[PDB]
Amino acid sequence: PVELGECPLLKRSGLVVEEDLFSTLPPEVKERLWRADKE
Amino acid sequence: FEVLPPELGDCRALKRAGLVVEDALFETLPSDVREQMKAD
C-alpha cells in the first residue's frame, strides 16, 4: 500500500521486499523513499 | 485531460502518486484544496 510511504522512519534498507512488489508503488513516493535513503 | 475537478478531496485513497498524470494536470487544484491535499 501507498501508506508505507507515510512512515517517516522507514527507508529502502528498512523496507526489505521483492523488486517487483516495490515497483508496484507509484514512482514519486519511491523517489521520496530513495531520497530519504541515500542523502 | 483538461482540468482536474475539486472532488479529489472526497476520494479517500487517491494521491498524486496514485493519480499519475502530466504535471500541467497536477497544477489544477483550488488553493483551499491544495491546503487540504498537501495535508492529505
CA-to-CA distance for A36 and A39, rounded, in angstroms?
A: 6
| B chain contacts of residue A26, beta-carbon cutoff 8 Å | 15, 17-18, 20
Could you tell me the resolution of this structure in angstroms? 3.2
Binding-face residues of B in 18-37 toward A, CB within 8 A = 18, 20
Q: Cβ-count burial of A33 within 10 angstroms (0-12 exposed, 13-18 middle, 19+ buried)?
A: buried
Q: How was this structure obtained? A: cryo-EM
- Cell 514519486 belongs to residue: A28
Task: Answer whether A11's CB lies under 8 Å from A37's CB.
Answer: yes
A5 and B CB contact within 8 Å: yes
Contact state of A29 with B15 under an 8 Å Cβ cutoff: yes
> How far is Cα B40 from Cα B36, in angstroms, rounded to an integer?
6
